[PDB]
Amino acid sequence: IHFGATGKLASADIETYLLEKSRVTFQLPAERSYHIFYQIMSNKKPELIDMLLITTNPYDYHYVSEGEITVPSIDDQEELMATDSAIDILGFSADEKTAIYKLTGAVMHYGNLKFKQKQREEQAEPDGTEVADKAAYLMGLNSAELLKALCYPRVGVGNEAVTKGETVSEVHNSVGALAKAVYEKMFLWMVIRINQQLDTKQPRQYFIGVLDIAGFEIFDFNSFEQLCINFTNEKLQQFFNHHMFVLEQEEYKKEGIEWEFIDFGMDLAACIELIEKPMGIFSILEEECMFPKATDTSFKNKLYDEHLGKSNNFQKPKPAKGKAEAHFSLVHYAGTVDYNISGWLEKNKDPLNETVIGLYQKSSVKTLALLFATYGGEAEGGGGKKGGKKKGSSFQTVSALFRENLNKLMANLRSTHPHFVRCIIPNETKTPGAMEHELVLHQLRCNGVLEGIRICRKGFPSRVLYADFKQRYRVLNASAIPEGQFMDSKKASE
Amino acid sequence: DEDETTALVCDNGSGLVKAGFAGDDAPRAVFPSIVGRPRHQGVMVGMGQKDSYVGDEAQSKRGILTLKYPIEHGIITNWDDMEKIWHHTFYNELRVAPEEHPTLLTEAPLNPKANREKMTQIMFETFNVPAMYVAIQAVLSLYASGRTTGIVLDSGDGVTHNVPIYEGYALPHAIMRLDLAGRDLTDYLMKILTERGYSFVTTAEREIVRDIKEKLCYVALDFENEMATAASSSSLEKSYELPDGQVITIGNERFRCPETLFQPSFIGMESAGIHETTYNSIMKCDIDIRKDLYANNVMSGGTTMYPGIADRMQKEITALAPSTMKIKIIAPPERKYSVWIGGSILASLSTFQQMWITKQEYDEAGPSIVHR
Amino acid sequence: DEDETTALVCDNGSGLVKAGFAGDDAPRAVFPSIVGRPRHQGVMVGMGQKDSYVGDEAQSKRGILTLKYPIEHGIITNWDDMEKIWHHTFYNELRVAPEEHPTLLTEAPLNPKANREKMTQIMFETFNVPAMYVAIQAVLSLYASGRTTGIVLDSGDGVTHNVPIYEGYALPHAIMRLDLAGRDLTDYLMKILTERGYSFVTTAEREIVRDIKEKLCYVALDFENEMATAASSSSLEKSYELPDGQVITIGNERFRCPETLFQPSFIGMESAGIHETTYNSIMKCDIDIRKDLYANNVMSGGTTMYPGIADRMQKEITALAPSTMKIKIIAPPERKYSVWIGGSILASLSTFQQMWITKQEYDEAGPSIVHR
């Protein structure tokens, strides 16, 4: 929030990190996908239903009814408008406001796209042009061209373009990949477009950043996504520990106490380097992604040969307890996290059928066309089989950005006066006035709260802020303590 | 992005330089590996006196300059003239300033230790690049075809090589070099085409024999009963129209030119040919790794682009290899840039960052550092 | 169940480790008894730097590591490298945590007192197992064939032994050790097969001579008129197809290899052979127990698996033994795991619980406790 010179509002700026792409295609049993879907099928704006070519029964869209469909505390009908109206206010063009919708339905349809094995062949052949037709139209595509690209992905290995055939299992999976890809991008776009409106000409002198992200969560199962988040947090933490060190040291300087101490951040640098530094996890992760014939297993070994025994924060797992398999544990400030490396290579490659993307790139639906541009502009760079996508501006890592973004962030965080807020969850059971112990205890460790207490206690536990000191105790030598507190907010307590 | 965008990949060849940004799919810059020095004093209209010319301006103006090739058979032979080609690559071709770009370079198969140290000395000390890295060419070609073990038959403009690679380490004692490549091949076509009763008299006749070789040449399988076919005279013939009308016909010689790669005897070479050499490399390697190499004959290089090269090689080594073996000749379409693409991939990779030799490593360890 | 499920059985050999859970019918884990140490610095793609390799990863990657065998002739010779093979067995092969599993181990026939105390020191003090037990190998083989008195001819990869056992107590002064086994036997086949006019040149040729020995080798009875038979050339010959097509033929040598076990003179050994040694063990024992040993020649070990080994031994000792005697050569089918199976039985047994050495016994009595 970019405040002006006077002190009155001037601009805003959003940025999104780590979106749960999986919901779009999946959902746990007690959960559900994004609201939008359920919003739309609610039927408050019936045109929409016919416009998108769907029904009102979610069980027609596998992608979005794997879990739950309705939530009592939510009125999908009301929201739909909220949403709707917001779009408008946000300045979106009707068309775009149309793309959004139309595009959000295509995705539903995709999950309905079905295929079958060609006879005597292990190839995938379309099981009908019922749905494709809709998806095609809704996206400003051609049914055929689409089903081909999907089935007979025309690749470019060597210096040419080699037409490759896919399996049934391969298609279903690629489709899902686009569905997710498209949704994401779109989401990104919306944000940008928002930002665009939120751009004013008026001068800006300062801003107030409000960061909302998740905190270090430990699961019996920790995958790639966990690392990314944990890493974010372990950084954020150090960010604090330092601010505190800086802060602390001012008092002892203001007062005249004689206390020497090392930055509290330092304690964490070990873990961070191991992740973000050159021969660290990410790198080994993002290099192997360049090896056309690497395995998760491959990656794994590379991870060890290089860090195992040589690095302290690096450890081989404890396979048992509440954990599900073995690969590698790390020693974060909050504790030991047991990480499972399986899918990483892929997840990190963001494999997308480029033939299809092609089609998008030349859609009749501008917006859809837009969203893909940046993929279309780096292809120059990865023209032949093997090599480096970055040559043409294509991502080389699933993780290559995350880092870039996380840096651009932690940098923005520095030219800032950090203000901290830790949100807590009392009981899993949803009951006011109650608290499970160990549940809150957990949070406290991973929060930073327990670490702030530590650093405090190093020592001189309780530390009173001066005004907070005046008020409560003035009364003790009332005359002389009040005078002190009033006369100099600090000098007073003195 | 700092260097995600920023990594450069320069593949130095005997005939062509391929260059561009790690990330791209193909080289942003491709140009001859020449440095022309004017034979006389004078100027072009509007320009100043130029001491030197590089790449295409050296080729185009060849009549008034003495042309020189810095890389003889894949090895840098003149370091004054190579620093000139690099300068041209950064500043004119890619138009980047080198002192803020990491640079991945390539070297040849048994490139002398001292050279890898010298181009590092010139990269860091005269171009002041932040960091650099030298990859071996066959090794980038393999890797660009996804794998890590295989044997690459690599063939460009001045050299042919066989580099058996196992889990990434190129095997020094099994590497073979055959000094007959696309350059030799254009000059042989030249003679079998003048010998067809022709004349490549002016320089506009000379240059295009090379464009005939690229467009119309073939590697026939059963080159035996292809000559026999030539004689019955089928519609096998192929006429090319010259810079002007002068429609030249090439029927037969069309494949007599790449049959030189299997029979060096066509050109007074006593060395063995491509397929035998693939094989000999292979019976020079460990026994347990020979099934791997056989199912992974990756081809790269401009001269391996002749259609039907792969089928001839397929059958050439099946019939020399023990029948219990699986033969597999991979020849991708982008192969004239495999090497480069393998570098683009690798250098844009997430894990490569920790192998870049930085000026910190160098100023502290000497050229020895990158030499490995 | 606490330990009914929970007892481990680890049989440490010169060539192979056999491991698994007491209760099972056969070893869950079988793998070479090697520990590889990399000759150079570097990594596999995706892995970290590894200081060491064990079992099959050491065999597969043998070209870049220095391989070492911890057990020479059945005795543990390097304790740093053995603790490495045990670690691998528990944590990677059986994937169990050792500190909650009783462990039955095996040792060799005249295993030095000090070793049985040392592996106990390492089992309890570095692996922290709840309880353990060391059985003698021939003794588990016998017992797995139901009985308690007999003489075991035990023959694996580095040693052969004869261990006369009476009501369970192996008889120290009658035990014979012959250092010629399956390892020696693969290398002799190697030479009689190169000598047949062949070449096991690459490492993929070396390894498979051992798979020829296992699949096609025989112990003929009347090895005399089997050579004679070879000459008339019957359909006695046998061709094996190599990793590739290269069909190698082995007619005769097929049995010249196990005739080495009866004639050590085939390999420049001056020692006596298997059958004479069975016998000599027996005329070194008490007189009254010799009818028992003769009717209970139990065979165990990978190298006693050559078909017709039992018939040759049957007739070999009948014709050395007094005719008043009953000869009986028991050779079960699972014999390459007799030792292990005997341990599985014993350790899963209802009465064995009271012989387990517990950490209570150890922390209180020192390694002496299990040493007996």
Curated annotation (Swiss-Prot), chain A:
Disulfide bonds: none annotated. It is found in: Cytoplasm, Myofibril. The modification N6,N6,N6-trimethyllysine is found at residue 300. Residues 406-428 are annotated as: Actin-binding. Residues 1-494 form the Myosin motor domain. Muscle myosin is a hexameric protein that consists of 2 heavy chain subunits (MHC), 2 alkali light chain subunits (MLC) and 2 regulatory light chain subunits (MLC-2). The rodlike tail sequence is highly repetitive, showing cycles of a 28-residue repeat pattern composed of 4 heptapeptides, characteristic for alpha-helical coiled coils. Limited proteolysis of myosin heavy chain produces 1 light meromyosin (LMM) and 1 heavy meromyosin (HMM). HMM can be further cleaved into 2 globular subfragments (S1) and 1 rod-shaped subfragment (S2). Muscle contraction. Myosin is a protein that binds to F-actin and has ATPase activity that is activated by F-actin. This is Myosin heavy chain, skeletal muscle, adult. It comes from Gallus gallus. The chain holds residues 253 to 746 of 1939 of the full protein.
From Swiss-Prot, chains B, C:
The gene is ACTA1. Oxidation of Met-44 and Met-47 by MICALs (MICAL1, MICAL2 or MICAL3) to form methionine sulfoxide promotes actin filament depolymerization. MICAL1 and MICAL2 produce the (R)-S-oxide form. The (R)-S-oxide form is reverted by MSRB1 and MSRB2, which promotes actin repolymerization. SUPFAM superfamilies: Actin-like ATPase domain. It comes from the Eukaryota. Its main location: cytoplasm. The modification ADP-ribosylarginine is found at residue 177. Keywords: Acetylation, ADP-ribosylation, ATP-binding, Cytoplasm, Cytoskeleton, Hydrolase, Methylation, Muscle protein, Nucleotide-binding, Oxidation. Residues 110-123, 358-370 are annotated as: Interaction with alpha-actinin. Polymerization of globular actin (G-actin) leads to a structural filament (F-actin) in the form of a two-stranded helix. Each actin can bind to 4 others. Interacts with alpha-actinin. Identified in a complex composed of ACTA1, COBL, GSN and TMSB4X. Interacts with TTID. Interacts (via its C-terminus) with USP25. This is Actin, alpha skeletal muscle. PANTHER family: ACTIN. It is an enzyme of class 3 (hydrolase). It comes from Oryctolagus cuniculus. The modification N6-methyllysine is found at residue 84. One of its GO terms (biological process) is skeletal muscle thin filament assembly. The modification N-acetylaspartate is found at residue 1. One of its GO terms (cellular component) is filopodium. The modification Methionine (R)-sulfoxide is found at residues 44, 47. The keyword Transferase does not apply. In vertebrates 3 main groups of actin isoforms, alpha, beta and gamma have been identified. The alpha actins are found in muscle tissues and are a major constituent of the contractile apparatus. The beta and gamma actins coexist in most cell types as components of the cytoskeleton and as mediators of internal cell motility. It is found in: Cytoplasm, Cytoskeleton. Actins are highly conserved proteins that are involved in various types of cell motility and are ubiquitously expressed in all eukaryotic cells. InterPro entries: Actin (IPR004000), Actin/actin-like_CS (IPR020902), Actin_CS (IPR004001), ATPase_NBD (IPR043129).
